[PDB]
């Protein structure tokens, strides 16, 4: 028995229906065979010990789910999922990771298999902290978020939560993976949007630490306060405020 929750009820059906919905919405993805996507997804973790998963296991899925996102329209986020997706819900030329096909398919789901059999484990799955970090879910997110960050160019944006004790956290997906996978060739600038929940937060010690990381990687850093998130979303919806 693992410590984490088991695979989400109706995981196979949910992934397939998400794929059908996404490929209907996006005409550039209507080529995608959703059965093949599911087979590739399932093939990454079925009949495998769920502490023994690697990025290689997900390669067939990455090939089938590959997508050209306009590299100058990428929004990264850390600990502020809610507002990030509300933003891209309105500003529809922009993409977070969960607005890509692969990110859309997996968002809010858990899954794992087992060594002995070809069955999905609905009982329990490894928790990253208590059991093992090389589990089907964590390895999936590590793989797709690295590729997404590698794809970015020009000005990459990151939404951060100004109400947290650490606005930027080095130990997050953003702070340990995405930030080291932005390519200095492609990416001229990382612009942080600090969301307030009020005074300028762009000199916060953790923002200074983010700046330091970014500069050391030969990318320019810029920081902006969003002092009133409501007004911000209203003004993106109707610019004429």
């Amino acid at each position, epitope marked *: 028995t693992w410590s984490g929750p088991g695979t989400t009820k109706r995981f196979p059906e949910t992934v397939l229906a998400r794929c059908v919905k996404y490929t209907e919405i996006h*005409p550039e993805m209507r080529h995608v065979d959703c059965q093949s996507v599911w087979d590739a997804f399932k093939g990454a973790f079925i009949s495998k010990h769920p502490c023994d998963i690697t990025e290689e296991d997900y390669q067939p899925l990455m090939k089938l789910g590959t997508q050209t996102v306009p590299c100058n329209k990428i929004l990264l986020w850390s600990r502020i999922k809610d507002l990030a997706h509300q933003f891209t819900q309105v500003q*529809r*030329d922009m993409f977070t990771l969960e607005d890509t096909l692969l990110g859309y398919l997996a968002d809010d789901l858990t899954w794992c298999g087992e060594f002995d059999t070809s069955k999905i484990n609905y009982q329990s799955c490894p928790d990253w902290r208590k059991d093992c970090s090389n589990n089907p879910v964590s390895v999936f997110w590590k793989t797709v978020s690295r590729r997404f960050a590698e794809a970015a160019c020009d000005v990459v944006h990151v939404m951060l939560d100004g109400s947290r004790s650490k606005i930027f956290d080095k130990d997050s997906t953003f702070g340990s993976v995405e930030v080291h996978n932005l390519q200095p060739e492609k990416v001229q600038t990382l612009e942080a949007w600090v969301i307030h929940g009020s005074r300028d937060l762009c000199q916060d010690p953790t923002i200074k630490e983010l700046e330091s990381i970014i500069s050391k990687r030969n990318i320019q850093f810029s920081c902006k306060n969003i002092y009133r998130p409501d007004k911000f979303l209203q003004c*993106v919806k109707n610019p004429e405020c």
Partner: nanobody
Amino acid sequence: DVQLQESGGGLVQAGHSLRLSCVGSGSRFDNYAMGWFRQAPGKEREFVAAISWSSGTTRYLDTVKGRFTISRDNAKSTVYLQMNSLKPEDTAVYYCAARYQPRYYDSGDMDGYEYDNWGQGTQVTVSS
């Protein structure tokens, strides 16, 4: 809420083409499913064509399939109706309409839209 403005109507001979345009302002164009309707004189308004925000889904009136094509350009806040092989029975005022649509819409819901933003119309007359 979005303000709509049609143009490109005109007087044309049967068998010829016209391209209608409709520009939106106010709220972001890419938040709206767009529809073209038409009303001939003394007749009721009827649906002609529609398109999702993403251009992933279109719908057409049966009698215009393979003659009319709907499309859009969200960066220009514009929707188009390319009308080929026009017939005298295509004579009407053509109206552009908008309906808020989620980014992640169900294609099923494209059949039941009541459109709540309307342009003033563009006159199309087809002669013979």
